[PDB]
Amino acid sequence: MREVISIHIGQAGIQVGNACWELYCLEHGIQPDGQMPDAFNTFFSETGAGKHVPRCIFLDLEPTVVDEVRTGTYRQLFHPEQLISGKEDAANNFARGHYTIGKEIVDLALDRIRKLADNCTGLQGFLVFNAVGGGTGSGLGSLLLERLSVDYGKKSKLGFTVYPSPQVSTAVVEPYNSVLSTHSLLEHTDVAVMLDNEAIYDICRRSLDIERPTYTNLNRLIAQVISSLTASLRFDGALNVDITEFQTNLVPYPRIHFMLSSYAPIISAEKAYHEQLSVAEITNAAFEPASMMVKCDPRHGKYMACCLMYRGDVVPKDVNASVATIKTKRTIQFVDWCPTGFKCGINYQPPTVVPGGDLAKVQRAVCMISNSTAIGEIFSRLDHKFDLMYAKRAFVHWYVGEGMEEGEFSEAREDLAALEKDFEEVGAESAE
Amino acid sequence: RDAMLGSLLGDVIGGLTDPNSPLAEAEAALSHADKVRRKKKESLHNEWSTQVFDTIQGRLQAAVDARDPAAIESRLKTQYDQYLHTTNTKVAVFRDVIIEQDYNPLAAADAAIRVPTGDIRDPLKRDVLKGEYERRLIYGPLGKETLGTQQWGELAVKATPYGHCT
Amino acid sequence: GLRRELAEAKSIAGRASATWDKFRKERDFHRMHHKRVAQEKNKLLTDLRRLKEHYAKYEPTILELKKKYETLM
Amino acid sequence: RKERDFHRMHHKRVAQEKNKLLTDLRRLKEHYAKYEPTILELKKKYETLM
Amino acid sequence: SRLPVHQYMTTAVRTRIEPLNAAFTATMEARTRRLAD
Amino acid sequence: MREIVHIQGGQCGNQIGAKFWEVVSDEHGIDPTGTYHGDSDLQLERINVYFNEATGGRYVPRAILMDLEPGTMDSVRSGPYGQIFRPDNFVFGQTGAGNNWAKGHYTEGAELIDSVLDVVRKEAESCDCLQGFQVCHSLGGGTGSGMGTLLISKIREEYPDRMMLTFSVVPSPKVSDTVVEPYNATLSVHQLVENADECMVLDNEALYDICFRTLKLTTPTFGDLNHLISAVMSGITCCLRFPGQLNADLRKLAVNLIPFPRLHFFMVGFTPLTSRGSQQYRALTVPELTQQMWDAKNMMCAADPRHGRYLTASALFRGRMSTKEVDEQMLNVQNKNSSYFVEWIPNNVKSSVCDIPPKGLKMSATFIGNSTAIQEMFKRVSEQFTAMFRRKAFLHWYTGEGMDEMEFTEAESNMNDLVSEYQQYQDASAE
């Protein structure tokens, strides 16, 4: 059977983890207590066979965000053995999360993973939810990702990361924590999907006309993106895209695995009635840059490979018409060596709506994850951002004191510059 | 009966080891054919590699060798700064409209590495391309005339003469 | 314009002259091998007949050993 | 070119039927090779009974 | 003096397939031999 | 005493095969439960071609459902006419190829070929005199292509004196559902030229065109695409299931239509396809069917018969008709198109007549065409292969399971001698 273990590391992972596991429960009819609604039914309740514990791990060194889940509305859903806290947070330090403080917690994390791997019959992949801006999401994220490659082989490791914005920051040491974690994301992930914080802010400002977006609103439509791509495993459809189908069609080379994301219909409740949501209409909106979840230009790069997860009442006819309209337009540019670049996946289940959510009930939805050479555009912003700070060697005595050597900064810079050269190398076109 | 049994056993046993046996002749023919096809397979792989892949990657890696990383980060910094300036000034940026004076995102696609790939003659396409070689000294527009795939959607399916009033 | 037509005709004659030299060599390449494989084809035909005669000896031999083994038993 | 294509067509056709008799030779080879362990075992059995 | 992208196998892909683990190490010794020669 | 073993490969094969057993079981009178309910004795006479005997008068099809995922077999089991199939024939994998050719061929297809070959060998030894092996799959997949072509290799080794029919759905240039789709097709056709005796070639863009140009369906799903493919498969076996004036079984169609062993790829098309709005206006006659049959928009192949030359054609007419009108109509289309038919084959089109029409149509015709013109579809797959293979794009996924990049050269080379031979026999002339 298909089955996926998703690990959530850091505060940003578990706030998404609170949002995504809220959406999974409403999709399958699971109540927050965990019970799906003759004498066997009385036997069914007391044996716990109607309880559905998630295949998830909430680990974070900071206790004040994980106990909120422990005392929240989903206290009965999660096993208390699956929620891992810590004495002291990594606190915006990749050295603390990877060497000193994250060392004594990751061994307890693989113990929880081994218990979750024993319950599953045949495992298919791993999902990592973290932010490289913070200490725990980057540091403990890299440590957990490094150990999971050793203990488990042939099992995919899908990476969901929240990279820092070029303009928006909640901290100062994002360039250090992002660059060091990126070297782990080159090496140990299988497919990495980019998420940008203020790109969702511009989505909620424009598409959902909310002038006051907070982290609860951003994580809600983040939870739209995660469930949409894995929706082929939950429900049947005309064209299924498994978690191994995702890798074999979307990454051309092992280094090239960082990917963008997009969700096409993002319409408020009032705006929904006047808008005609057609397959051809939203597919044009899917490739629109302001509807993308990463602040980047699709026109800057060339789409090496792309996938389309369609949900709802979508026939295979008009989605193929939407394929051709994208290819014939001059603004959207493909790379020359990939003529057939689109993977089409259709699920028959319409997308669920969370109660009190800003997203409206939409019949048909598109989730667009594409591999582009304009993701090194994002890296080049963080490249000189890290290089300007490291030139004067500020914020280094925190990393040096906590076990890390000085040469780790140059090695992660060396790996990141190799990927910068990589995207120009593969972004080359052969023209006679 | 005994003499016939001896003769039959003699020939069916000596055929397994005799170098002049028809079994030995068939084994020699099969081994010769297997060696010939293995050598032809290896020769085809090596000649395709040396004539196409080595040349194309030599040109591409030479172009990347000539290219310098620092100029690449400077150019992508300028491009990203232009994009953030446009998103800061304008009330959202939309893909369909392009103001050339304001913002030219196609310059990024224009400033890309170019590899000639005109001198290369593909060894795998020898029999297919011999005809166009001898006519002269990718293929042409091929397929049958069909409906435009832009018209396959639910909107133009009523505008096209097929299914106009159905 | 008369000089251009003469240059085109000399180019056509020159380009053709190189090619039909290659056509004569290639057609000689095909005739020699086609006759060679055809002689080799007839060898496999005689080899196939001999091996079928050799294989025809096998199934009586299995039967005859079964007959002799029972009589010896 | 017409004279070349006539011999090109004939050379390919004999080359194809060369491999067809080759595979027919291999199929008959595998069939009677399975008879070989049986005829060897009965011959060893016949010698021991003698 | 970098490895081409179609030859560089990352560790996540490498730990999946032991035939491809040996494929990358065959390329690694090819790099050291070519530079020494 | 003739029978055909049917094999379904992958999601495309299971979906098309479900709709093929929808038609022939309804044509022969099998209910959903599997019992006979036909009112004509001719239906009951020849059911051993596609069905096996069972207790209580049941008839199970000679179908082997194989794939690598449990997802698309839950659909065919839950669908209509899904209970007639034998659960012993429900062989499946669990990991799934994920549209990778060699994952279903080398590293995971090897663990399932031993299971699927036991079921085929058990079903082939049970019946008496085999006619051929019919398989329906797609070339661009990884589940039905990589595993399916290896079964084509295996059953040809131990059944070399039997016919073999492949109804393979090729990739389309205009519409694409997989990124690595040209890799799967190039390696599949390389395995199909030597093993498969003859191939029926189908393309989704041609099926999408005929579903809207002719049938005027504004919303074509996969259901009505597979229905047209289902009608073709029942058209080929019209000789075996029912008597007729002229009988041409699977062997006779193969020997008439295949002049040379490599030139065995075909283009097909069902003739009487009209929309219901224009159903009552059109008059069904033998000259009316022949005009529609030779039209390019009635073709279920993406190749253009206008651009090429017809090496051999065959039309299987079903229904009560005069054979004199058939011989006049085929001679009419050969004379009026002399540069469209091949010159060195006199009597280019050989046809057969069966007196039993299908359900709902008084007259019907099934067209099989060996045209040289099929090189263009293989060229379009070859264009996308050299776009990707010359840059080693998406190739590290293929070389993991032991089949290295060295094994791609002969696949494209054997993708090229086929289209060179088709090009050579087109230009070649008499004398």
Ligand SMILES: Nc1nc2c(ncn2[C@@H]2O[C@H](COP(=O)(O)OP(=O)(O)OP(=O)(O)O)[C@@H](O)[C@H]2O)c(=O)[nH]1
């Ligand atoms: N999308 C999203 N991003 C968040 C959220 N919360 C925090 N982030 C991102 O995470 C960054 C803050 O650092 P974190 O990764 O949360 O740090 P942490 O997880 O608390 O780990 P430590 O700093 O070691 O305690 C911010 O810059 C945000 O971009 C959230 O709820 N949703």
Ligand SMILES: Nc1nc2c(ncn2[C@@H]2O[C@H](COP(=O)(O)OP(=O)(O)O)[C@@H](O)[C@H]2O)c(=O)[nH]1
């Ligand atoms: N005619 C038809 N074609 C289909 C159907 N389902 C999939 N296909 C074709 O098969 C291709 C994808 O093959 P895929 O489903 O991945 O094959 P698999 O690997 O065996 O599952 C697409 O290009 C479709 O055109 C179907 O129900 N009918």
Ligand SMILES: [Mg+2]
């Ligand atoms: Mg924290």
